[PDB]
Amino acid sequence: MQYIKEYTDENIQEGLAPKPPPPIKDSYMMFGNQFQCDDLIIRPLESQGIERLHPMQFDHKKELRKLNMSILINFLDLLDILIRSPGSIKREEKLEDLKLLFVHVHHLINEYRPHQARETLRVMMEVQKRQRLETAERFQKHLERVIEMIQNCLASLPDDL
Amino acid sequence: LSRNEIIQSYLSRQSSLLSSSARQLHVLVPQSPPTDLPGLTREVTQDDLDRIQASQWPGVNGCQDTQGNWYDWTQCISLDPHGDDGRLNILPYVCLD
C-alpha cells in the first residue's frame, strides 16, 4: 500500500497554484483490478458466453417452471445413467447438462433484479406521498383545535368583561 | 465428504428444511398477451396508472390468494403448499427500509 505523494506535494501552495479536480471519465477505467467500463448493461446477456435454450417469447414465470421441471427430469435421467451404463460418455454431458440448466435458473431470476429495484422506488414514492399528506392532515387538525381553543378563550373574556 | 453419520445426516436434514420451509396456494395467473410497452403498446393513458395506484391488480400490485386474502409487495405471505404443519413463509418482495 502507498500514498499518492506527487499530488500531495502539488497541494501545498497558495494563490491559485493548487490543482483542479480531474474531469469525469466516460470510458474504460481500471479501478481495483477489474476494468468496469461504463455504459455496461446491469444484466450481461446469456448469449455472451453460454448457450440459450429459450426464445424471445420469454414469459419468465412459464420458463422458470419449465426449467424447474427440466432440472428434476434431468436428475432422474442422470439416475438412469447411473443405473444402466455408468461408463457412458453421456454422463459427462449430463453432468454438464443440468449445470447449464442451473445457470439459466439463476440467469432468469437475476433479470428480476432490475425490475425489483425499479419497483421498490415506486413503492417508496407512494409511501413518501402518503406520509406527506398524513402529516398535512395531522397538522391541519391541530391547527383547527388551536383556532377553536383561542376562540373559546376569547369567548370567555368579554364574559369576564 | 468421506463419511456421513446419523447425527450429521439429520443435521443436514434440519438445516436444509429450515432454509427451504386443503391447499392455500396463490391463485394461478395465466399468460399475459397484453403487456403495456411491448405487447399491447398502449399510448401512455391513465386507466393503467390509476389501476396500478388504487385498485387490485394481481400481477402488478400484489399476490392474490385462495381464502381471499390480498398481499401487496411489502407484506410477507404465509402459506402451506403441503399437507403438513410446516408453513412456507414467502418474505416481502420489496422490504421498504
Add this chain to the structure above:
Amino acid sequence: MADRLTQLQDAVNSLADQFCNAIGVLQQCGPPASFANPTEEYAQLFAALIARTAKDIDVLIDSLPSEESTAALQAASLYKLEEENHEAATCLEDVVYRGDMLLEKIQSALADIAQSQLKTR
C-alpha cells in the same frame, strides 16, 4: 436481503445441494447384497425433501411478479408519483405557512400580556 428472490435463489441452491447429498449418501452407504433399513429410511427422507424443495420453488415462482408490469409501466407510474409528490409538498408548505403566521401572532400577543403584567407589578 430478505426478498422472495433471495429465497428463490437459496431454494434452487438447496435443490442442487440435495442432489449431490442424495447421490453421495445413497452410493457411499448401502446393505451389501444377495444373489440396510436405515439406508431405506434415508432414501425415503431424501426423496421427500427433494419433492418439498421442488414444490416450494414452484410456489415462490408463482409468487413473484408477472410479465405484465413492464419497465415502462413502472416508469410512467414513477413520473405520475413525482408530480403528485410535488403537489403534496406545496400543499404541506401552505398549511405550515398558515400555522406559522397564527403562531407568531399568538406569541406576540402573549408577550404583550406578560409585558403589561410585569409593568403593573
Add this chain to the structure above:
Amino acid sequence: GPFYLMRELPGSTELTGSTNLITHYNLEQAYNKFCDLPGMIDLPGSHDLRSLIEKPPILSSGTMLAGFRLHTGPL
C-alpha cells in the same frame, strides 16, 4: 411440451455391475468347487531357515564334472 435438454438414455441393459459377473464370465463351477498343498504335496513327500531362504529367493525373483569333483569318503 418437451422438457429442456431431454436426450436418449443408453441401451436398456448393457454391461453393468448389476449382472452376475462370474456366471457371465464362465467362472461359476470353479467357485462351486472352491466354496494345505503343503499337506497335499506331503501326500507325496515327508514334511512341508534355508527354506526361509527358498522363499526369500522366491521373493527376490558340467554335471559329469560335478560327479567327478564330488570326491568324498564313506565313513
